[PDB]
Amino acid sequence: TSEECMHGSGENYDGKISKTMSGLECQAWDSQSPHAHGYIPSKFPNKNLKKNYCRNPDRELRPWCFTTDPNKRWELCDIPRCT
Numbered sequence: 258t259s260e261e262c263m264h265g266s267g268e269n270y271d272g273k274i275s276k277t278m279s280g281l282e283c284q285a286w287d288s289q290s291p292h293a294h295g296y297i298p299s300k301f302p303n304k305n306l307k308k309n310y311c312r313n314p315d316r317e318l319r320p321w322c323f324t325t326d327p328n329k330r331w332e333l334c335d336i337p338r339c340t
């Protein structure tokens with residue numbers, strides 16, 4: 258709902274994809290479970306976090322989000338390359 262295909266790292270990216278490249282559907286950036294992690298939307302008027310859609314707060318290579326797995330905290334999302 259901003260940029261749906263990216264040049265690579267999806268800095269601004271808040272498309273619609275929220276699937277970790279090697280795992281699961283991400284757990285939203287809010288507070289739910291498995292854990293009340295950092296990067297909480299309540300502290301950002303910035304157009305960063307959203308529901309579970311991958312972002313890049315530390316601007317990692319591939320945009321990531323927290324997973325739904327109780328042991329896998331963060332994970333890189335596979336977001337579609339603009340081709």
Ligand SMILES: NC[C@H]1CC[C@H](C(=O)O)CC1
Nearest residue numbers: 295315317321330331332
């Ligand atoms: N290593 C990239 C980036 C991944 C998430 C991590 C966190 O969960 O805080 C911050 C660093």
